[PDB]
Every structure is written in C-alpha cells, then in structure tokens.
C-alpha cells in the first residue's frame, strides 16, 4: 500500500513539472507571436 | 521512508518468528536432548545384549 502511495505522490511530482514546462511554453508562444511590439516598430519608423 | 521503516518492523517481525522457533525447538519434548539420551541408554544396553 505504501508503496503504491510512493507511485501517486511521483505522479504529482511528474504534474507539477508538465506544469511549469506548459506555462514556459505558452509564454514563449504568445512571445513569439508577436515580432515586433509597437515600441519596437515605431524605433523602426522613426529610424526610416 | 515510511515504507523502509514499515520494511524495518517487517523484518523484526521475522526476528522475533525465528525466535519463536528456536524456542520451540528448545521447549519441545522431542528435542536432541531426549534423542541423545535415547541413544546413550540405548547404546549401554544393545552392547550387554
């Protein structure tokens, strides 16, 4: 019993990964989403 | 480590079984105690047979 307790608490460890690796994806999609910001595009043309 | 110190009880659990055994094997009537004697009396009498 103990030992399929150890089981359930590694799969919760395993969750709180996925998590974390989910929210690092996300944040670099909706980064990589979006080239330029609009600060970014009004440098360009003021430097154009 | 919970389940290494129930591990732990598991195995004195068995200690105290094979103690329970070896008393037995003590507390017993026909221990090797009965049995060297049985050959003892019985040698001293086959040999004046």
């Given at each position: ?9 590694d799969k ?18 909706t980064l ?17 | 480590?919970?389940?290494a110190v ?44």
């Amino acid at each position: 019993d103990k030992v399929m307790a150890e089981i359930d608490a590694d799969k919760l460890a395993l969750q709180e990964s996925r998590h974390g690796a989910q929210s690092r994806f996300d944040s670099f999609n909706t980064l990589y989403d979006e080239d330029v910001n609009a600060g970014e595009k009004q440098a360009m043309d003021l430097y154009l | 480590r919970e389940a290494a110190v129930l591990q732990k009880n598991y195995l004195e659990t068995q200690q105290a079984q094979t103690q329970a055994q070896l008393a037995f094997l003590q507390s017993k009537f026909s221990n090797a105690a009965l049995y060297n004697w049985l050959r003892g009396r019985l040698s001293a009498i086959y040999y004046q047979f």
